[model samples]
Target chain A: QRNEEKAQREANKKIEKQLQKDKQVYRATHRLLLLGAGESGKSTIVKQMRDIKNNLKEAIETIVAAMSNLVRACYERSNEYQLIDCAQYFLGIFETKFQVDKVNFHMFDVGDERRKWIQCFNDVTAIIFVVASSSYNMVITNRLQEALNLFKSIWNNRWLRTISVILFLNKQDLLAEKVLAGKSKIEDYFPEFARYTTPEDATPEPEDPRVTRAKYFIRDEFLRISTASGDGRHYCYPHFTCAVDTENIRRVFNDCRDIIQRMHLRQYELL
Target chain B: VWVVGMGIVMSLIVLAIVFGNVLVITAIAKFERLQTVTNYFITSLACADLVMGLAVVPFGAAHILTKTWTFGNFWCEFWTSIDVLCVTASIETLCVIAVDRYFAITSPFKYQSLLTKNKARVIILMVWIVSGLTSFLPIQMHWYRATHQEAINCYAEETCCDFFTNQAYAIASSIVSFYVPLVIMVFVYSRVFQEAKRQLQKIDKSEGRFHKALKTLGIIMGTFTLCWLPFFIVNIVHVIQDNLIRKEVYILLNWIGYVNSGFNPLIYCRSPDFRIAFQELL
Candidate 1:
């Protein structure tokens, strides 16, 4: 009787595997969202990725502004489809992770337009915020305050844990006349941006509160890139390549593929 | 006969210089009041000398062991740049200090006015700037001339003579930056020495104190000469023997040049005033 039961269970498992194969969808396509201040070069960059389709669903919402509605822009290129979605103040439910038959591509984007996004923009896989060097002079000011606010909002969420920020030192050609003439340093302005702190006192101690707070608040997460000439600039690619975690993205894709296989088995209830 | 004996004697002299300079640094740090203007000059000189010793000695030892600059072209430039900068700065600082001491001892009535802290600060800044600019400018103008023939390889011989070959330029740089200043210092110190001795002779009541002051100044002047003169002599020989000397001999002379750094502090610590100050600190 026991042997008969074991055989029955094995048969059920085989059927479930067959069903999973039929239902599982491969996560071959990736979707990316661009966000931030109105003129933050988000749209201009999307226009450059020829292989990625541009669905203007989100950008239109931003422009229409009827009631600060969420927008989803979808596009297809080379049999793979992608979407760029945004909201005036909040991230959509799908912005975090979309589980369709156990396969999902994590979105990497930033929140720039000011609204309820202080809370809504959390739980993204990563974010790339375009910091306009020209405007803020790369100092620790209200502009950096916005960055800090978003950072704190997503502080504990695991999905946004490995977020890397890229500070596009845009308009380098203009920096000589405007910013540098004042002997401005992007670093001197922001104490948070410093890699290491030289505290007021020279005595080195481990239990110092300043040191502890510094350790907790500081992480070298930002990159400086000259992204002034829009996506047409080839020099910007290397900097972006350095900025994003391509290895982790590939790992996520593999994990999704495995999950899809597992989900197909559940779909049929073959057991 | 003298050449063989000269090698041994030179080695001893260099050792003394290095040891003496080290004592000077330790002594100044030991004493709180020695953290004054003259002591600051002493400290700078000792630091430059120490750097030279650390850099030049190791380079020489390595070259002697390998009989070639096995560290390759990059280190060759690095070591050379360090050597030029440290030696030049050390000599410059020594000259400035000598002039400083000269004014203090000879014109004690107006010593404070003459050797004001601001003037000392300016002199120190100029010493560093002149040392760096003089060392680097020629390298900048001519480094491209010795451009790598192949990216894969890293060894090369110097072919450019934009500054290295120009004896006049070398002499001018050394004299104005080192030798001339050195002359001014020696002259001033000798005069100060004479004036100090004369003053001490006249002061019957404070004769003991005056003698002590003279002795202290003598130790300083003596240490300066003992630490610096050997390297200067070697440098002169280097200029004369550049075309004729064997690579081995040249490398030895270079090593001799660096051994001067470790002597300044040794001399400082040997000073009674510095030693007492250091003891009090403890």
Candidate 2:
């Protein structure tokens, strides 16, 4: 009789531990912030993420391609009547499970206005900093610097030291065109960036030297400010993306999710 | 001879309303390429006006020609119910178009995703549903049965439809179907003009097209307000002041409101794209 009672007590303790673990996993929600300058494709990235998650991957890609063609045609014909502008914040919530753990992702696609951006800087678990790669040596240099400064300010926040950051150097398709046109190098716009040369060979496996160098430049830019944060524990993930390309954006988003999930696990272990 | 002349004029007006709105509807339906989300709301508006021309205008024309409610009490109630339903639907649809244009001009990036075909269908459904509830369901079915019996009975002999005589019902229905939507249309169009100006500054090349479109839409809105406001105002006054206006004057104002249905297609005809579409359809 004594042995049976002891066994029952141990079994109850195991069940209670499992329940506690399940509760922790279910309660884990990560808040993601999308920040950038105006026209940096921040909203487009958010939309692409949603489309990818909703399994409208091919449909969205086709639609985006058609719209791009239409835009080009309109430009050639000098009929600029159908241009669209985004003027609102977007919010999305996504749920997922990993092994026995459930996770909720809360994404906020914030507007780039100064006042609006400043007001959304609380309780963020991760940040996706979008920068238009085609803005490198163009007249958009001022806005590009503003975007970098925005990222710097967020990195400087004391309470966000543990937050994960992803630098999305977007518009790679346009960047390839500009570089092929002999316009400028990545170092021209971002002189403080250390990466100097574009890779020579264009292999078939998604590795382009110009893109690699651009990502390095963006990563280095964010890392400079990120290292200034206390304890230097936070890391900035960088990717080369074209916001209109759903597949590319999806892969980058998956990478971001992984990094966030790993950080969530680390946080739980610490607690 | 005057009665014959009036009959000819009324018939001509009814023909114009039906033909023009049907053309609008046919163009929208036939041209798959032109059926954008914004154009869907226009199609819904055309539907309302088409129904007005079909069901309400003929009775209105016959009443004017005969001048003594030749259709009897049941037909009178039926015609009035149809009139209220079609006109309210038309006014509410115009308000929806204004809102659609506002979003198209103000937030073009998200417009396609935000105003998908499914969403537009839902909005169009809501427009007709609200119009029916406000106009036909309440007024025709006598929802306010006992509340205003005395007011209704006072002018029951004057009107073929007793509900129209109740001052409170008249005011409430007019405010719901006409005045509220008119105010919203005005406010929304003003914002659209402001946003268009800002966009014009950003892209100077499209100035001509923008100004032309804006001027045309502005004139349409102005004509709508001018044609309908007098009728509703006179309706409220007739109910409250007990028919102080002359009968001919009341008929004139009512005809002016009907003329708005005819004016919509003519206003749309000013657009080059619409003209082209019509030409293709013909």
Candidate 3:
């Protein structure tokens, strides 16, 4: 029965991928939720969309990523929690004609359990989870743990199970600075890292092996939570980007746009 | 062989105390980010522990191993004076730290204005002065010293330094030094935790702050209680019913109190600032 499930998922993903390759237009808005723990950089990614033109709110602002030639009307917006208060301004725009060809990136912080505002995204097209990988050693919050728990909650949300969640394992600059400084070890915070090795299949990003190991450990931590609770009606693809590095973010989004498109097509069975 | 074993074990604890506390002291002194009022109290506490390692524990251990006070009566009193001063100061500083957390959580903006660095310095100075008065003045004045009772004690052939405070001083000293601080610490942390629970939800930043405080509270209170409870209990008991606890047992419990010196630096690791500072310093 698991084998049957595997073949069905395998065939379905390939069809969606090929449909994306052939460039079919959905001709409708794709709603993407960019969610993360506080200070994990939902707002920065929105600013990066502008820098994709140049070079990212109140702490709540939204943008639509309009990658003109590509996903057509890709809009990028950010801010979290208090999303409902601005709903009249935000959801109000959908009533207009400009909604055509809109791939909207709706961003917010990891927050509040009631999440009445979360359904404000209208069940969401896909989710981009920004996690600060550098927060491994911080306290007064195990900052990384907050992001993981938030991600897991979203990953297991029954309403969103069919959607793929993208992990923007953001903050490589700070993470590299931390890991190479050889202080406040990842192993100290996450003791399993003592026994953890980056998989042999791991690719180093032009980075230190230590940096590679640390980032992957964080990435694996989020994925571990996802799959363990995934209980994979879906896929979680992870990308590494430092919010300060514009070029890195652009490339990150370039890969991400395709995954978003694939998920979009899969969501609508556009094939 | 048993003497050597216990001697080596105590020596190991002494070494850890020095190394661990020196790391804390240097980290706070060297790092600009770490010179906050909270860190100042921690740094002061480490100094008390460092003194415990340096001035008192070694001499006490030597007496334990050799079974003689070769250091002379005057010097033994000096060491004993420091022993009381540092122990009282350490517990007192821990009490102050709990109060700091209470204000830090309850009204941070006010706490910021009220407990500046110089104020922290004055507060810590008062900590040691109170400790200093309690130990040296009473002890040196011979107010706490007993009437010449037993040659199983001090000032005789095969002479040794045995401190058996008069029952009046013993109860008074224990209540002031240990019991008072213990009671205050519990009460202060209770208020701190209460204020924390009021401010916190499942996802408040206060949630993390609350967890950190909770972990730190458990360790600090648990360790302080574990290391000192036996000694204080044995101390008060021995005072009430002399020779109830064997001398060796009293000595062992006192060594347990000495071991408490090593754990303060370890408990400070619960804070990220100290962890990073210790990381960079090491």
Candidate 4:
């Protein structure tokens, strides 16, 4: 009878520990705010969370059709056909519940228009500031300044002092195109870039000089912005992104989710 | 001398619209206080205006300066399409703002619940979708191709292309883009003014803010009507009269409408917060 009682006590202890762990996870909710300049791909990043392969198939086909029309219009030099200009904003909600960790991610996906409606900043746990990487071109000098000013303002928010900020350098694909065309150099726009050479084995094979330079330049820019206030604790997580590429954005989201989860765990002394 | 004078005036207008709207966008983005449900629509309106300053005004200025469409046929079509899209979206956004204000003032208690963030986003999406369809479908799809062949041929010889040649299409667009929104704004603003007046009598200390709001509202409505009425009226008249309007008159009326985008941010300058924000930008 004493052996059976001992076994029962061990099972009860395990259940109680599991319950405490589950309760801690259930109590945590992470609210993430996505902010950026107009057309910087904030909505596109949110769209990446959905089953985009199925949802965007028809949308992709439509865009392809529009591209064909554009090509034909250029070929014929006709003013008869109009090119499609459809820029829409999307807001998505994603919830994930694991065995021990249940994260309720309330994402506020805002565009240039909806961004104006961001009155409540106190509740946000983190901010993802999306900036178009291609905006570093000479022609978009004004945009770069605007983006820099915006980042400074957000970083300087009194209520958001300790919150984690993720700077998403979006539209790397377009930047690559500009680099390949030799139209502009990233260093010309961002002069504060420090030379960063990744370890020989860190990257597989040789990478484009422009691409390497662009990544380094953006990283330096973020570091410059973050260190400006002289607050060492104002941490920033910077990631390069292409909103259309699901795998890339998915990885970003996962990293963000893990950071937020770890933050919660550390806050509750459960890490 | 005539070209120089027009050039100076057009350049000033373009600068005012671009700089003014940029100030508004920057202010709203910089300040956390300016981000409210209603300001969403205003920001969308500012975006449309910004597009006007960026794409429409410069192109219009180029045409005026050169005395012809020097950018070629493809650019001409693209410019006209953008002009229509931005203008239509601006009007629709203004209408949405009016509706939002109407609800906000009339039922202040229920405003928060009624106009949540999700609903506001959906409304904004609808405004863009509707604006895009109205502007792009008729022109891009060549919906009026069979009915307006003669008009197309006539414009083909000229430097500019008219998006609305079919009488039915022209009327439908005016009613959808202008008349409906105008009616909605009229009704909502009148009710809003009445409510403000009632509240003004109830609270004496808050009267100044209400008065300022009312004045700004009046200027917004007056400027919108003044800027757009002439163009819409002339457009309808031209459609009915079978293209009898002079090209200069068409250009003048169209530009008068363009001037509306420039005036919008100026109206926002009346707010002390916006003024401070603008000062910070300098």
In model 2, the clashing pairs are A85-B109, A199-A209
Residues B60-154 of candidate 2 have per-residue lDDT tens digits of 77766765665456567667778888989888888887787666555433343467777999999998898888877775676534354564562
Mark the regions of model 1 whose C-alpha exceeds 4 Å error after superposition.
A1-271, B1-31, B143-165, B203-253, B277-282
Q: Ranking by DockQ, best first?
A: 2, 3, 4, 1
**Chain A vs. native, model 3, TM-score:** 0.61
lDDT of 3 by residue, A77-99 (tens): 23211121222232212111122
Give the winner by DockQ: 2 or 4: 2
Model 1 lDDT per residue over A1-271, tens place: 9999999999999999887555433223233343444333443332322112234555544434533331233212211211223333222322443433333444544432444443454433224344333333332244545554554443333443333232232322333344335454434555543565543333233344443333222222221222221211011111221122234334334333322322221211210
**In model 3 chain B, where is the ten-residue run with the lowest total lDDT?**
B201-210
**Cα TM-score per model:** 0.40, 0.50, 0.51, 0.49
Candidate 4: docking tier: incorrect
What is the DockQ for all candidates, taken in turn? Answer: 0.00, 0.02, 0.01, 0.01
lDDT of each: 0.48, 0.66, 0.68, 0.67
**Could you give candidate 1's per-residue lDDT for residues B1-282 as a string of tens digits?**
545564565456555656566666776766576676766777888877766665665555445443456554555666666777888898778777667755655443244445554667777888888998877666445442323243223233532111133434545555655577667776876676565455334322211211554566566666666655655565566566666544455455445445545545654445457657656645
Comparing candidate 3 with candidate 4, which one achieves the higher DockQ? 3
Pick the TM-score winner: 3
RMSD of 2: 21.6
Off by over 4 Å in 3: A1-271, B151-153, B156-158, B201-215
Point out the worst 10-residue segment of candidate 4 chain A by lDDT: A262-271
Candidate 4 on B19-57: residue-level lDDT in tens? 878878877877898787777777888888999889989
